[PDB]
């Protein structure tokens, strides 16, 4: 199948080299057939001009299209709404801080003069300062880092003392994290605990950890690997850096557009399903000619969907193409079944890139303008505040520049 | 590529060419050209992990190699570091070439640019009316005036002052009357 | 003598050092790994002796001019100077240990591999290559906050993979035991 | 060589036991979820950033 015996065969082999899949198998074949001195001149320029230069062209065109889409009236309106709600959330946090400090001092002056309710509220308020201090945060981070350390020394043939040690350490860490979750509930309330996206994730991971502990009690062998997710709480270390704004805004944009990310990953699933059904129609029950059925067959639907996914990831798609050509005859008459894989690797290696680069560019940019706008409004508010308070006492990336120009043009 | 090729030659050069391994007679570190071909093969991600496993410690050495023990577990760092270093540098090259043309990748048809100037050069073949019917002190002055129509920086005198300021900013390399020639053409 | 060392660094020395580095890189490309006893390897060994001598001379010139580490704006204040120390000292130490005695084996190959840092001198000796390197490092600093998140997520995935497949990737040569 | 790792992962039965082909095909979701995240999403985050 991989020969230059014809223009169609030459196009097929060249296209298979473009996808950089087994392009060295063909190069080695021409190193055995002919001399190996000149064969690199055919194939290394082939790879550079077809897979590196054309991928650069694709990335450039897609990035330009995403930039033009971003500075368009409807998407601009959506981002303006997102920034408005982030501004209002910061304002509400500050004002609720005012009200909480006031309620604390009111409780203090009421107590210095219903007693059970007063004591309960005072204890709740002491917890609420405790769960927000810069010492509880570091204690929680140290506990997480000790829990990350325990799961990271789980190897094969670990000492029999280590298995029980980590069993009891898992129980101890679960107790500690239920304690932390309960304390944050009590100090903040379910209404305000779940306001934070990290707190919802942690609550979900605590529930998953309890479920996994119960399941392992039922079946002493199984391991869902959900307690390891408590290592994502190490992302709170970014809170004490200057990188907090950009990452928090990236997560905010991801959450905001999650109704369009789920819908995006469902179209990928629908196209994978369509190509799996087509693969069962064409090559269903016909990969048994080699005297054994491959792992990547199209007989069952899980197998077909896994084969389609593996062709989308672009690993050994050419081997599956050869097997599907021989399954339908051979090089003699089954070579028109190579259009299934050509279409699935063109419209599957470029829609994957299209969708995931759309997600990444859109949300990363939204994060960039969010953090830049909040920084600029911080400094503008500071300077206006200065010039009003003193009244009464007596570079950018090419993407951002082009985005500003596009915004001006579209306005 | 050169540094990694030399490292591969020195460390991984004397492994025995077995066709059932991934250090073939096609894919050896035995010469600079062959090591550099192996690096280009792994840059494109062509079973680079099998090469790494064929380069690990305790491999059969070549018949004409003095050292009996050949291959090292340095191949882990070698191949992992090459993979993501090459990926990062190639992606930086891609992004540099992309942003070098970002005003063209984001180009919008309505707004006039270099295509307009090339079209006006082609107009050479009065014809201004036909061109404007086909469009989104002899010809250079008309070029400047039509660029003025393309984007706005009496109002005519204010624009002349803007153009004089621009000319002062971008005065040519010792030109007698080139930017001043544009100013005499920008007078109308 | 420091004025002499200063003028030696400005009498078209940069281009000579660039030519030396380029020729030594070519020499590195020319060595035969499989046949360590080749005559070509002997000729390139003598060439490497010459190149090591040249680099040691430049090294001591920079010692006398800049001064080792005392004051600001001196040697060892730029990592390129430490890299030059690594290259030169590794070559000299390998030469000292290259007594052809056969006492140790694994060390000499590593100290010969230490020569591959030689082309990385040009990345500083050429200002435009230094600018490109600085741009690349700036990109690496830009994506460093997402590299940490990437490594963390891949660490959770790796630990889940361990818990799923720890000790299970064993097999017999026959598929029946 | 990711599908060979997938094959070894599914065929894996138990600790210190040999493979049983076809066993544990539910563990193909670990690699589908991994591909959705790192090769697809995170790498595109690097490219976009």
């Amino acid at each position: 199948i991989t020969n230059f015996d014809n223009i169609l065969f030459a196009i097929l082999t060249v296209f298979q080299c473009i996808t950089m899949e087994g392009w060295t198998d063909i190069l080695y074949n021409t190193n055995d057939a002919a001399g190996n001195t000149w064969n690199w001149l055919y194939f290394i320029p082939l790879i550079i001009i077809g897979s590196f230069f054309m991928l650069n062209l694709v990335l450039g065109v897609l990035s330009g299209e995403f930039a033009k889409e971003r500075e368009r009236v409807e998407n601009r309106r959506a981002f303006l709404k997102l920034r408005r709600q982030q501004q209002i959330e910061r304002e509400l946090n500050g004002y609720l801080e005012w009200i909480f400090k006031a309620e604390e001092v009111m409780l203090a002056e009421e107590d210095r003069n219903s007693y059970f309710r007063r004591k309960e509220k005072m204890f709740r308020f002491f917890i609420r300062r405790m769960v927000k201090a810069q010492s509880f945060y570091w204690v929680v981070l140290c506990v997480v880092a000790l829990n990350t350390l325990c799961v990271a020394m789980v190897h094969y043939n670990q000492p029999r003392r280590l298995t029980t040690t980590l069993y009891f350490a898992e129980f101890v860490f679960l107790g500690l994290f239920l304690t932390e979750m309960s304390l944050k509930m009590y100090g903040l309330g379910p209404r305000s605990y779940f306001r934070s996206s990290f707190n919802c994730f942690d609550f979900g991971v605590i529930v998953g950890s309890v479920f996994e502990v119960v399941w392992a009690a039922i079946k002493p062998g199984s391991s869902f690997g959900i307690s390891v997710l408590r290592a994502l709480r190490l992302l709170r270390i970014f809170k004490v850096t200057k990188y907090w704004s950009s990452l928090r805004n990236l997560v905010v944009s991801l959450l905001n557009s999650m109704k369009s990310i789920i819908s995006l990953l469902f179209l990928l699933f629908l196209f994978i399903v369509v190509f799996a059904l087509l693969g069962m129609q064409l090559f269903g029950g016909q990969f048994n000619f080699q005297d054994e059925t491959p792992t990547t067959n199209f007989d069952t639907f899980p197998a077909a969907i896994l084969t389609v996914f593996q062709i989308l990831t672009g690993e050994d798609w050419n081997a599956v193409m050869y097997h599907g050509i021989e399954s339908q005859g051979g090089v003699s008459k089954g070579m028109f079944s190579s259009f299934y894989f050509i279409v699935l690797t063109l419209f599957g290696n470029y829609t994957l890139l299209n969708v995931f680069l759309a997600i990444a560019v859109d949300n990363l940019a939204n994060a960039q303008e969010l953090t830049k706008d909040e920084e600029e409004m911080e400094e503008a508010a500071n300077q206006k505040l200065a010039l009003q308070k003193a009244k009464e006492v007596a570079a950018r990336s090419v993407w951002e520049q082009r985005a500003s120009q596009l915004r001006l043009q579209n306005l | 590529f050169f540094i990694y090729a030399i490292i591969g030659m020195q460390v991984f050069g004397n492994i025995a060419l077995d066709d059932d391994t991934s250090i073939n007679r096609h894919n050896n570190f035995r010469t600079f050209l062959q090591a550099l071909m192996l690096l280009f093969r792994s840059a494109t991600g062509e079973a680079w992990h099998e090469i790494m496993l064929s380069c690990l410690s305790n491999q059969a050495c070549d018949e004409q190699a003095n050292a009996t023990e050949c291959g090292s577990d340095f191949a882990y760092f070698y191949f992992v570091s090459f993979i993501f270093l090459c990926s990062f540098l190639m992606l930086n090259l891609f992004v540099a070439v992309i942003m070098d043309n970002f005003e063209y990748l984001t180009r919008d048809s309505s707004i006039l640019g270099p295509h307009h100037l090339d079209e006006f050069i082609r107009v050479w073949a009065n014809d201004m009316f036909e061109m404007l019917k086909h469009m989104s002190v002899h010809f250079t002055s008309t070029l400047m005036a039509l660029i003025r129509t393309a984007l706005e920086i009496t109002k005519q005198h204010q624009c002349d002052a803007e153009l004089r300021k621009e000319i002062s900013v971008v005065w040519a390399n010792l030109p007698q009357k080139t930017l001043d020639l544009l100013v005499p053409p920008h007078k109308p | 003598r420091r004025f002499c060392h200063y003028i030696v660094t400005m009498r078209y020395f940069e281009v000579v050092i660039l030519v030396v580095i380029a020729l030594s890189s070519i020499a590195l490309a020319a060595e035969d790994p499989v046949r360590t006893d080749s005559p070509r390897n002997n000729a390139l060994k003598y060439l490497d002796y010459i190149f090591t001598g040249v680099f040691t001379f430049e090294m001591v010139i920079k010692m006398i001019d800049l001064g080792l580490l005392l004051h600001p704006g001196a040697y060892f204040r730029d990592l390129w100077n430490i890299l030059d120390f690594i290259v030169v000292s590794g070559a000299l130490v390998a030469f000292a240990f290259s007594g052809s005695k056969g006492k140790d084996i694994n060390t000499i190959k590593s100290l010969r591999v230490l020569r591959v840092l030689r082309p990385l001198k040009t990345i500083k000796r050429l200002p435009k290559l230094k600018a490109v390197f600085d741009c690349v490092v700036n990109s690496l600093k830009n994506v460093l906050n997402i590299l940490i998140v990437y490594m963390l997520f891949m660490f959770i995935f790796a630990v889940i993979a361990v818990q799923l497949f720890k000790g299970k990737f064993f097999y017999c040569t026959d598929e029946s035991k | 060589g990711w599908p060979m790792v997938l094959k070894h992962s599914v065929d894996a039965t138990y600790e210190e036991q040999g493979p049983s082909p076809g066993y544990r095909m539910e563990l193909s979701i670990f690699y589908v979820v991994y591909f959705v995240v790192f090769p697809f999403f995170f790498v595109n985050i690097f490219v976009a950033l």
Binding site: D25, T295 | T21, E50 | - | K7
Partner: peptide, 25 residues
């Protein structure tokens, strides 16, 4: 799991310690 040099198929991936290259492990 096919040994080194055994005749194999690429898509089978039953090529323990290597990969099926040119029909041989």
């Amino acid at each position: 799991c096919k040994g080194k040099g055994a005749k194999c198929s690429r898509l089978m991936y039953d090529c323990c310690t290597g990969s099926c290259r040119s029909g041989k492990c």
